Design an enzyme around this catalytic site. Structure first.
Site, PDB file in Angstrom:
ATOM      1  CG  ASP A  36      -1.911   1.183   1.226  1.00  0.00           C
ATOM      2  OD1 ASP A  36      -2.473   1.387   2.189  1.00  0.00           O
ATOM      3  OD2 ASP A  36      -1.975   1.915   0.145  1.00  0.00           O
ATOM      4  CG  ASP A 220      -3.305   4.527  -2.771  1.00  0.00           C
ATOM      5  OD1 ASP A 220      -4.538   4.783  -2.166  1.00  0.00           O
ATOM      6  OD2 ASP A 220      -2.537   3.390  -2.247  1.00  0.00           O
TER       7      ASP A 220
END
Ligand SMILES: Cn1c(N)nc([C@H]2C[C@H]2c2ccccc2)cc1=O
Length: 360
Positions: A36, A220
């Site tokens: 992440d 992201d």
């Protein structure tokens, strides 16, 4: 420039993120860990939640140390809460090192673990500024670089069950074609970048570029879609609607229904390394139309800004060059293209007033 041991070290299922195998504690306990770039905590299942294949058992680890503090993380539609400690951590398909890292042992959660998913934790790869509870809690990658000779960079080839590569401490040239083009990391908190111009099929949106980055643009891996500010999404959809006049209901555009090329290519121009210089990355409907043949419209709105998620990242080899505060994009050797159009990274272009595209 070659890291065969790390190639194809990512797995996942569509829409459920990409995970890497890791081990925690002594002796090593294996977990699948979601990669992440949009958060900064290393956090792992530590109790037998029914959706979990496995979980961190601190009682089995001789190297575990309690920090005697909690951490509570609410996010958009969910939460996790845990107990801080440190322990020994490695990446079996990564560099041959073992680091002492902060780990939050997750003891309570809501809408965080996914029923039917195959991961048990999350690896926050962004910077300490957005670490929880505060910036004093050293993120995993910071610990890795501080304790070893692993270079201060990582790169991601997200392919789309899905696959990909996370190269830790380097770049693997087999993973891309053509040249890498770099855009500055504006501020080391998220992996924040500045979008400078947007074309669909070729057409500028002619919006004050300050909008494209209101109040943020981030890269992201923890997001599936390309996410746009409403004002930008409104205009973006508008032109994609008109670009696609040949054939869909209004909810489809809000991603409220599924739809079971006439679709335009999307180009984002990113701020370049040089004054008045930019480059553009070009993606396809293949990218913003993800199979769920029903597809979900993978562009949506945000109040926190632009989010360049798997829709963008699956087009490209992405280099998180932390040492030089820049992110590199190249055409990915794995991206899915038809015979007519392929994903592109092109420059240089001349773009003035790129400073005005960012929000203070
Ligand atoms: C978009 N995003 C990202 N990148 N990270 C998080 C962190 C909460 C943890 C997370 C990651 C992935 C799935 C669910 C929760 C939330 C979140 O909403």
């Amino acid at each position: 420039g070659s890291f065969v041991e790390m190639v194809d070290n990512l797995r996942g299922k569509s829409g459920q993120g990409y995970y890497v195998e890791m081990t925690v504690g002594s002796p090593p306990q294996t977990l699948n860990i979601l990669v992440d770039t949009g958060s900064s905590n290393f956090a792992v299942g530590a109790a037998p939640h029914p959706f979990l294949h496995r979980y961190y058992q601190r009682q089995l680890s001789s190297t575990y140390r309690d920090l005697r503090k909690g951490v509570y993380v609410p996010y958009t539609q969910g939460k996790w809460e845990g107990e801080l400690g440190t322990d020994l951590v490695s990446i079996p398909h990564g560099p041959n090192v073992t680091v002492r890292a902060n780990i939050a042992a997750i003891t309570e959660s809501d809408k965080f673990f996914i029923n039917g998913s195959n991961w048990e934790g999350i690896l926050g790869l962004a910077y300490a500024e957005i670490a929880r509870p505060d910036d004093s809690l050293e993120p995993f990658f910071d610990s890795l670089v501080k304790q070893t000779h692993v270079p201060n960079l990582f790169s991601l080839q997200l392919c789309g069950s899905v696959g990909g590569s996370m190269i830790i401490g380097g770049i693997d040239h087999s993973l891309y074609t053509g040249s890498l083009w770099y855009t500055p990391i504006r501020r080391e908190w998220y992996y924040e970048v500045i979008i400078v111009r947007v074309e669909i099929n070729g057409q500028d949106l002619k919006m004050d570029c300050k909008e494209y980055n209101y109040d943020k643009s981030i890269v992201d891996s923890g997001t599936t879609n390309l996410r746009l500010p409403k004002k930008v999404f409104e205009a973006a959809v508008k032109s994609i609607k008109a670009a696609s006049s040949t054939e869909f209901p209004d909810g489809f555009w809000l991603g409220e229904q599924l739809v079971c090329n006439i679709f335009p290519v999307i180009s984002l121009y990113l701020m370049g390394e040089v004054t008045n210089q930019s480059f553009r990355i070009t993606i396809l409907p293949q990218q913003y139309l993800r199979p769920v043949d029903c597809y979900k419209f993978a562009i949506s709105q945000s109040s926190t800004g632009t989010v360049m998620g798997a829709v963008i990242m699956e087009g490209f080899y992405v280099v998180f060059d932390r040492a030089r505060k820049r992110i590199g994009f190249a055409v990915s050797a794995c991206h899915v293209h038809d015979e007519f159009r392929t994903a592109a990274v092109e420059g240089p272009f001349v773009t003035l007033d790129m400073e005005d595209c960012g929000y203070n």
